[PDB]
Amino acid sequence: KLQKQLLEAVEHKQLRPLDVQFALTVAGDEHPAVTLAAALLSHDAGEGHVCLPLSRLENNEASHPLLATCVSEIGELQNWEECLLASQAVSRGDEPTPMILCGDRLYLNRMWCNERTVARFFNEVNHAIEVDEALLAQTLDKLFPVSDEINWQKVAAAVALTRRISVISGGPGTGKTTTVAKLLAALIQMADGERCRIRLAAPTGKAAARLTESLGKALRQLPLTDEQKKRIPEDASTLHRLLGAQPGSQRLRHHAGNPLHLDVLVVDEASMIDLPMMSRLIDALPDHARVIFLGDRDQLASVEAGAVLGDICAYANAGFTAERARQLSRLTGTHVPAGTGTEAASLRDSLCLLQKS
Amino acid sequence: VRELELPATGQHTWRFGLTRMLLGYAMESAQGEWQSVLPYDESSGLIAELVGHLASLLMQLNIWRRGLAQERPLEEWLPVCRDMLNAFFLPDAETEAAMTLIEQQWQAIIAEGLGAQYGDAVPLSLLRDELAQRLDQERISQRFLAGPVNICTLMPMRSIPFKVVCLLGMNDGVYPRQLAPLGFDLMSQKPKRGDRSRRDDDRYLFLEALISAQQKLYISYIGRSIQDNSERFPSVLVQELIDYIGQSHYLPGDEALNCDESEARVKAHLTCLHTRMPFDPQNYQPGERQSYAREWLPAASQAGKAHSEFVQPLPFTLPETVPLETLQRFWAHPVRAFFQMRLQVNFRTEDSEIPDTEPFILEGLSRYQINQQLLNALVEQDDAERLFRRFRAAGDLPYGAFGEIFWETQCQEMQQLADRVIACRQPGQSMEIDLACNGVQITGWLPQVQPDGLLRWRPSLLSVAQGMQLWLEHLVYCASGGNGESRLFLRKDGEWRFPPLAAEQALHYLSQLIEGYREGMSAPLLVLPESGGAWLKTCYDAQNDAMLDDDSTLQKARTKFLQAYEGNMMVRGEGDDIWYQRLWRQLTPETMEAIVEQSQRFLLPLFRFNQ
Amino acid sequence: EQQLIEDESLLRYQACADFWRRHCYPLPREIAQVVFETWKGPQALLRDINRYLQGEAPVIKAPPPDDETLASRHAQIVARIDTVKQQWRDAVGELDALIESSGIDRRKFNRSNQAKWIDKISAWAEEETNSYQLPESLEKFSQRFLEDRTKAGGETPRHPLFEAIDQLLAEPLSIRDLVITRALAEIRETVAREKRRRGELGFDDMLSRLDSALRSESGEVLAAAIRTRFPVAMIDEFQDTDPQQYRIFRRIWHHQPETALLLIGDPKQAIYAFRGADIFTYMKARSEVHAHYTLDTNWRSAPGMVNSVNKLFSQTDDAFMFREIPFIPVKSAGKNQALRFVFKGETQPAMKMWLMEGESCGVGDYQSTMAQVCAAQIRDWLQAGQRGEALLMNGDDARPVRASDISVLVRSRQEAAQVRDALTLLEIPSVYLSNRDSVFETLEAQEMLWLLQAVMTPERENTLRSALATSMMGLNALDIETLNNDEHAWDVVVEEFDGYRQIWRKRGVMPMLRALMSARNIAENLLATAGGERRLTDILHISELLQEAGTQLESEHALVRWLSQHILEPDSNASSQQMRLESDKHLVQIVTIHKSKGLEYPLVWLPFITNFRVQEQAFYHDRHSFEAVLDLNAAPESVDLAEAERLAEDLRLLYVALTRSVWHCSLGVAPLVRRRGDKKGDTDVHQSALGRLLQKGEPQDAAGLRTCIEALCDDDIAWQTAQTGDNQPWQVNDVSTAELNAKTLQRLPGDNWRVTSYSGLQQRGHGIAQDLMPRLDVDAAGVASVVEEPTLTPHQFPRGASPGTFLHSLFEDLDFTQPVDPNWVREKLELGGFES
Amino acid sequence: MSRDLVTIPRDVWNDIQGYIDSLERENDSLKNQLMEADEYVAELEEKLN
Amino acid sequence: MSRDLVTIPRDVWNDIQGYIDSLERENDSLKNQLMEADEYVAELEEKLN
């Protein structure tokens, strides 16, 4: 009887046909509530949301019209989780299943894999890079003339150089491109004899050309040697072109088996980087590549459903750890504030916010 | 499947495929099989919406085939047709007329059935055949006198005066149209005045068309067969007409002659035999049958240029950076690489027809991929039963015991192969390759490089193409800087082994490889990996490191070269290929000598350094 | 009322697949192993029985019992092997001692070799009997083998186990025959059931139904009615008859008063065995009739040409190796006594044979040399004809030898190509005629398929660039590179192909191909290229066929699928798919022996008449019963009879090929050996039809063949050695071409006058909707969503053209004065199909 | 290499391939038998001595 | 359908014929050698017994 209501909801454009077909094929034998939850999860995945919380399944003042109509069929459930666990479709990840019940949320297998990949990458894949502090201090002093006060750009450059993966957060017109230019200029001066390969990427070609022009204008400001000028990247390209996305299929050229031929990577406007593209970009990178992300926390693309940077920069408000505060104080030659409490070391130590416009 | 009285395998069905594609949208294929079905990776993302629509289509069909199966009274069959039209079709301005016609015929059939008060059950096939026959019986004549020229069949009792009346298809046996009586018709046995037969109807239609022509009458028939150039005869009516015309009239200046000669001469004067092809020059001459179609005039004038040779020299410039995969793909098949890479020409159909039945055996790439995966699983000592269950969930393996026998034989062979690979395997890591040869930069990745050397295993028969690929990899490895020995194991105890080489010599040989790639990008290289390989293996002496020039050695080399080129009944041979056929239709000893020279030049180090 | 289907190959393959699914799937692994060893798949099984599925079912020698099953046969074979193994396991020690005691030469039977065999048999015996395969040493340990190697005058080793091995190895153990018989029966039943369900019929099915009806109890009244329908029946071409046809003809007309059955035929010209015609049917019919008549006058050929054949076929007592086919000498017409062929002022013999030098000769070298010699001789004939030295003379009248007179007869399509190339080397145009060919096998079909696939989707670059690179288009690599480099020309070509697709959608298939050929000058460049006329004719035929097919198809993509399906599997028996004549000009004609039957030619050349082929299949006819017998075991006794029938068919083909010549016939003969074991060994010419007549069925050598040829020669028959002719091309004088101009239309026909309606005058979108339904409510079009109706209000009534027509029909027949009747409205709604 | 080209039917070409392949199999068989014979006579000589 | 005719250079065709003659000669030589071996092994055996 639930199938007829699903078809009726499809006729009124309340639910997509793909969602209803998926629900019928997966949870046909299972409880009607399980089928309705699978259909709602497919609809949310079509909208672009990462997960469906079980609280949304519970009847509320604002809810899907179909859920209210199917209330009689589902009746009353004391716990949504216990009923779902019993179904063959939903599991906790121990066995391969189409849907995963993680905590209070429901995920698709592909979305759960991407979330786990991003979390594991930000937590443990990052490895600290120990370099000479005197050379770095001299280069930063050459980059930044004012050393009397704490400079957020100098701290951002120090964090980006001391850590593999890092994010420089800041609003438009706050001097992010100038900071990236100083970072690249310092990185080139750090290792002159060794081969350096810097790559630039952006989600859109418009932002790619904007980044190329701005980085050129910011790099021609400070004098560099010929060998240091050779290391400067020539141009940027679209992120889809960098991974070699085929027009017909979804397969990529630079998959996990074939890593990218780059050492340093910069990704401008990381706010438009959704979860699938981030999870696919993580796999292509090798273990020796340091990556830097550009964007702002308050941008709408960061807080949109499926984004990553919005939840990453959310912990930047806590501040740096106590030990990294002293480390950055010894590096930048100023007093770096320390954040209260300990929530996440590897995540908070790879973030920086530019509050000067 | 069970209704078709066939064993229900539970796979290779529409439901199975839909469940597979939806599981692919839900779950990644790397996870495994859920409820014995492997998810399908391709159906993912926004494009996956299409899958849903497809399911809806099937969701309709399975609904109707169940309902149409049961037999119902005539009264119940009325709402069906209409309900069947709105569910499957979105009607446009032109389609609504045909839909209304179908509904009208269906309603008329069921009304004629209900008029007699037939109460017994009626199957669907009866009404279906009745509908199919009535659709054939009905004809359209709404544009008979619309204003353009009328082209229709001869209808009885319809005689309208026309200035020009033409008749086509008057061959013997085609006209008059014949209809035989049932055989139990009492009227046909005893003819009576006023009876109507189709034969007499057509025999009188011919006279009606004769007398209806006001100004001009035209008659045409097929006198000669186009295939065999054999004589065909016209209808009896046209024959009687031409005989009467010949007997009645005589051509001027034929008064002296007798009646038969004059008749023959007159009948010859009215019959006009046209050409067999439209591009025949005889049509484009001043006369009665001069054509108005200047489309074939150029062909008749025979003024044209012959097709030149397809291959032409092209100026090519090497880019600064060339990937290693590019060089490997080029040296895989240079003759094909010229067409596929330089000209971007792929002689393949855009859509490949789906196999009619489920696979009962595995051949070609379907077997090769499974063998490669099984070998990769056995080299690392992984469980073969899990891979077997995965392939079973995929559905590639045959049903029942046949798939088990295939898997057992393949497991035995791959285990025998991997027993050698396990012994000479050491842990390693892939290193990025960046090299500069003659001003060209090569960037690549070499998987599973170990300090002992380069180890590769492929489940295929021994061939010189694998040796060329291994030699390219070995040159890249040695030029990058490292001490190692290259080893490649193949099917049936085949091994390609290369010792460590110096960096300078590796650069020297890679320079020749890059020059060969550059020459191939300009003009199609005449290098054959297999035929030239046999020629070198026969000519080259491994002990003395020299090319034998003995007449018997040369004769054996030519014999083996032609054997590897043309092949046996079982093996198509290297010569049989679309790309090779595109170059030359037939072999030439000049082409043979050029191929021998280039293949020797490019493949001599392979047999020289092979151990 | 029934329909007709041309092809049943798909039904045969589907029935075979269904039989495989039904039988092989429930088999256990132990039996599935043997089933897979015998056949890889259902298609491999169909490949064996496809010949026997068509036509009348053949009788199987030694048929397996019906009650027997596959598992029972497997258990029986396993029990036999187990008995043999158990006997060997007990006799593994006394054999060694017995062998030493036995007086058998050990030179044949080495102790070390014996030790190897003993160990090999012992290892095989110990292993579980999973499969039927047996070791080679069991053959060495057979009683008969031991009795052969045993020296005479001494004790012969004799054990019960040795006797058992001989009994076992006497007949091969397998399950093929049972599966073959069951598959034949099941596939025939399934195909018949499917065709009965669909209601369709076939050409063979009509004969089968008529035969089954005549044989049934109702057959008597049917035969009486048919006999009353036709009092006299005359059957022409009776040599090519089937058992069912003769059974029918006998049923209706045997021993019937006031009826006549005239069977006219020629047994010496029965060469259609591949179609299913049976000569043994004619042999059975000949014995049943006691009245035989013959025609003793030949009106076609010259007296010398008839005398040569009569002398050639009178050497042996039984020329056609069959007692039921006697040879009667025929006379010559009095009017044809004056005919003669004269070359260079000297009369030539009627029959001339060319002999190739050498003690032994291969097949390929023989064919090449004979093709070259035939080309040289044809060139010499043509040159002598043009100069006028060679003439064909009837009485005093003489005519020059033109190109239309000469003809070459070959047995296969591949040979024909070799003779065509040999003639092309000398610049002599030729035209090939055959009876079994399909236009879909040609490359032109594949190129047309690629062009259609490109036109259907011009937006995709890969398909359009692949179709442009076809040889039919005529574009080199330079043009392809120029088109790839420039985007503007590529976009122009894409727009052109889009226009082609529009023409395809609007006017049809052939109107698009016509414009495509006219725009790119395909026909002109094809006719300019050597050999392009055949390609152009094939293209035009394929275009006509594509038009005929797309006329009866639902969508445009359906036509591409139909073309691809016809290309993948082509039919040669179909008359429509037969390749047309290449050219209508008078050229040298290459015609197959089967097609040449019933035709006459002035000069005939047979370059490869000596070449023969041995058949391996064991399918024959009983000499006494005259019934087709198939031997599944394939015993040599059946292969010998099959070879004899093959040789008789070759003799008939040779007679048919020889009788065609009117004036002169030339044959190429040479000592042919399949595989030379020894130089002193006899040649395989005796197996050939011509060699058997030349050597009287006695194997000899090259010298013996030459001596027999010399002895046969007379005034009519002459022989000359074959040597390569001078490789000089035939020079043909140039011909002037008059100017050719097509007519022009000064006046253009006007489409102003037309009969129109308001809907057609105003509404263009309707199209042909007015033609289908003259009274269709075309005012309302573009139906919308009428899924649900809350209160069934008149506004919620279904909207469209059909509901509007229903509403109009309601008011059409309604009576205005009387009040509305609810039952009438209910009946109208029920008839219309709407809900109650 | 002589300019002259020789034409052979596709069916004709096969038989030579089978024949040459058959000769090689017979040759390989002859080699092993000869080696066994040589091994056997040498072994008997050692036993005799 | 273009695979009906096979074109080989005249020198190449002659070499194939030559290779076949040499294989036949080798076969004949192997035949005689084997016969000689079997004849020798029989005499040796008789001496042992």
Q: How many distinct domains of chain C?
A: 3
Largest sheet of chain C: 7 strands, parallel
Strand content of the residues of chain B, in percent? 5-15%
How many angstroms separate the termini of chain B?
57 Å
Count the helices of chain B. How many?
Answer: 21
Distance between the termini of chain C: 37 Å
Category by helix and strand content of chain B: alpha/beta
Which protein chains are joined by the largest interface, and how many residues does each one contribute? Answer: B-C, 90 and 99 residues
Number of strands of chain C: 20
Radius of gyration of chain B: 38 Å
- Quaternary state reads part of a larger assembly
Largest sheet of chain B: 6 strands, mixed
Q: Provide the number of structural domains of chain B.
A: 3
Question: What percent of the residues of chain B sit in helical stretches (DSSP H or I)?
Answer: 40-55%
- Overall strand count of chain B: 10
Shape of chain C: globular
Radius of gyration of chain C: 37 Å
How many helix segments of chain C?
Answer: 33
Helical content class of chain C: 40-55%
Protein name (chain C): RecBCD enzyme subunit RecB
GO molecular function (chain C): 3'-5' DNA helicase activity; ATP binding; DNA binding; exodeoxyribonuclease V activity; magnesium ion binding
Subunit structure (chain C): Heterotrimer of RecB, RecC and RecD. All subunits contribute to DNA-binding. Interacts with RecA.
Domain UvrD-like helicase C-terminal (chain C): 332-598
Architecture overview:
This is part of a larger assembly, with one copy of chain A (357 residues), one copy of chain B (611 residues), one copy of chain C (836 residues) and two copies of chain D (49 residues). Chain A is α/β, with parallel strands linked by helices and 357 residues long. Chain A folds into two domains: 1-118, Arc Repressor Mutant, subunit A (Orthogonal Bundle); 119-354, P-loop containing nucleotide triphosphate hydrolases (Rossmann fold, 3-Layer(aba) Sandwich), CATH 3.40.50.300. Chain A has helices at residues 2-11, 17-26, 32-47, 54-57, 65-69, 71-74, 80-86, 109-125, 133-143, 152-162, 176-190, 205-219, 226-231, 239-242, 275-284, 300-303, 309-312, 322-332, 345-348, and strands at residues 52-53, 90-91, 99-102, 105-108, 165-170, 198-202, 237-238, 264-267, 290-295, 351-354. In chain C, α1 packs across α10 (176-198), α4 (70-90) packs antiparallel against α9 (160-169) and α23 packs antiparallel against α24 (532-551). Chain D has one helix at 10-48, and one strand spanning 5-9. Chain D is rod-shaped, with a radius of gyration of 21 Å. Classes of the chains: A alpha/beta (357), B alpha/beta (611), C alpha/beta (836), D mainly alpha (49). β1 of chain D pairs antiparallel with β1 of chain E. Chains D, E: It comes from Escherichia phage T7. Chains D, E: This is Probable RecBCD inhibitor gp5.9. Chains D, E: Keywords: Host-virus interaction, Inhibition of host innate immune response by virus, Viral immunoevasion. Chain C: This is RecBCD enzyme subunit RecB.
